[PDB]
Write a protein that binds this ligand. Structure first.
Ligand SMILES: *Cc1ccc(S(=O)(=O)N2CCC[C@H](O)C2)cc1
Ligand SMILES: *Cc1ccc(S(=O)(=O)N2CCC[C@H](O)C2)cc1
Ligand SMILES: [Cl-]
Ligand SMILES: [Cl-]
Ligand SMILES: [Mg+2]
Ligand SMILES: [Mg+2]
Lengths: 9, 229, 229, 9
C-alpha cells in the first residue's frame, strides 16, 4: 500500500 | 541552530540542498525557516514536507530492514540495540516535525489550503510514530493520527474541490492509515473508492495542467485499490 | 564515541548498517572498530572501505551539483556558502579516514594484501581532497595521492598476481587519478591498457569464481579505455 | 571516467 511519495518538490 | 541566517537564505539553501539530495540539510534549513515565526507560503510548505518526508522515509526503510532481521533472529543484543537506536532517531524526527506544527504552524494557519496541509502532516507523522509503537501508547498515538486526519478531511470536504491535490493526497494517506495502522481495510477501500469517483466526476472543470496533477494522485488511489481488492 | 562497545559488536552493527543503507552509521561503527587498535581482517577492511566510500561518494556528488550551480551563477553568497559547507564536511571525512590509516593501520600492515589495500585507500582519499582543492596545497595534495598510489603499485607488482582484484582496482583508480587529477591522460590510458592485458594473460590460472571477480574489474578498465580513446 | 564503485561489500 502506497502513501504519497512526497519526496520531490 | 539557524538563528543567525536570514529566512530568505534558509529557503534558498533548502532548495539547493534538495538539488544536491542533502535532505538532512534541507530539513534543518526548513526548520530554521519555520522558527523565524512567519507563516509559510505554498512553495515553502512543500519544501518543509519534502525535506522531512525524505529524512523519515530513509529512517523508516532502515527500521523495516532491522525489524525484519530482528524478527527472524527471534524464531546477541546487537540487532535489537541497533533497531532501537534507529527507532529513537526516527521518533526524534517525528517529534521535531510535530513540534513545528504545534509551535506554531497549525494555530496560525487560517486558510483551508494551509490548515489542511499541516493537519495532513500531523496525521502522517503520528502515523510514522504508530508504525514503531508497541502497546503502551500505541492506541493514543493511533488516535492522534486519526484525529488530525479527520479534522483535515472535514475542512477539505467543505473548502476544497474533490480534485484538489492536497485533498486527494490527504485521502490517499488516510486510507493507508486505515489499511495499515487501524486494521480497517474496508474503511480504507471505501475511502479510496469514494475519493477516486468524486475526483473523476470533477475532472471536466480542470485545465490541462490541473488535470495532470489530479490524475497522478488518482492513479495512486487506483494502485492501492488494485492491491487491496 | 564507540569506546564502550565491544569490537565484535561494532563489526556486527556495521554489517547491519550496510543492510539498512545507513552508511554514516556504518562508518562510525567501523571507525570505532579500527580505534580498538587491532589489525583488521580482509572482510573488516572491506567494511571500512565500503562505509567511507558511500559517505564520501554522497558528499562528492553533492559538491559537484553545488559547484556546477555556482559556476553557472558566475557567468547572493548562498550557493558559495553552501558549497563551502559541503566541501568542509567532505574534507573532514577524508581527514578522518587518512587519520585512521596513519594511526595506525598502515604501519601495522605487513602483509602485501593489507598494505596495498590501505595505501590504495590513502591514494583515494587524497584524490578526493584534490578534487576540491584550489592552488595553494592542490599540488601537495596531488603529490600525496600519487605517492600513496605509487607505493601501492610497487608492492602489488612484486607481491600479487596481475589478476588480483585489489591490484586491479588499485590500477583502475590510479589511472583515474592520472586522467582526472594529474592531467596525464596518456599515462592513464597506458596504465589501463597494460593492466588489462597483463590480467588477460593470467586468467587461465584462475578458478571460475576468481575469474568472475577479476573479469568484473577488467571490464571497468575497458569501459574507461572506451571513454578515453 | 569510473573508479571502483566500491560501495557494496
Ligand atoms: C500530501 C501531498 C503531497 C504532495 C502532493 S503533489 O505532488 O501533488 N503537490 C505538491 C505541490 C503543490 C500541489 O498543489 C500538490 C499532494 C499531496
Ligand atoms: C579497491 C577495490 C575495492 C573492491 C574490489 S572488489 O569488489 O573486487 N573486492 C572486495 C572484496 C574482496 C575482494 O578481494 C576484492 C576491488 C578493488
Ligand atoms: Cl494566518
Ligand atoms: Cl602486522
Ligand atoms: Mg531578517
Ligand atoms: Mg573487548
Amino acid at each position: 500500500a502506497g502513501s504519497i511519495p512526497g519526496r520531490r518538490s | 541552530a539557524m538563528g543567525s541566517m536570514e529566512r530568505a537564505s534558509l529557503i534558498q539553501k533548502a532548495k539547493l540542498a534538495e538539488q544536491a539530495e542533502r535532505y538532512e540539510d534541507m530539513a534543518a534549513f526548513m526548520k530554521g525557516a519555520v522558527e523565524k515565526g512567519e507563516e509559510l507560503s505554498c512553495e515553502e510548505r512543500n519544501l518543509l514536507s519534502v525535506a522531512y518526508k525524505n529524512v523519515v522515509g530513509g529512517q523508516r526503510a532502515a527500521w523495516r530492514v532491522l525489524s525484519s532481521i530482528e524478527q527472524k533472529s527471534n524464531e546477541g543484543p546487537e540487532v535489537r540495540e541497533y533497531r532501537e537506536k534507529v527507532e529513537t532517531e526516527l521518533q526524534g524526527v517525528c517529534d521535531t516535525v510535530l513540534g513545528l506544527l504545534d509551535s506554531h504552524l497549525i494555530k496560525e494557519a487560517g486558510d483551508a489550503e494551509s490548515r489542511v496541509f499541516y493537519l495532513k502532516m500531523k496525521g502522517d507523522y503520528y502515523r510514522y510514530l504508530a508504525e514503531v509503537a508497541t502497546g503502551d501508547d500505541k492506541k493514543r498515538i493511533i488516535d492522534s493520527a486519526r484525529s488530525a486526519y479527520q479534522e483535515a478531511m472535514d475542512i477539505s470536504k467543505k473548502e476544497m474541490p474533490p480534485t484538489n491535490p492536497i485533498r486527494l493526497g490527504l485521502a490517499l494517506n488516510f486510507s493507508v492509515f486505515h489499511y495499515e495502522i487501524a486494521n480497517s481495510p474496508e474503511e480504507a477501500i471505501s475511502l479510496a473508492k469514494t475519493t477516486f469517483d468524486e475526483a473523476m466526476a470533477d475532472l471536466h472543470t480542470l485545465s490541462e495542467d490541473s488535470y495532470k496533477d489530479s490524475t497522478l494522485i488518482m492513479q495512486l488511489l487506483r494502485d492501492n485499490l488494485t492491491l487491496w481488492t
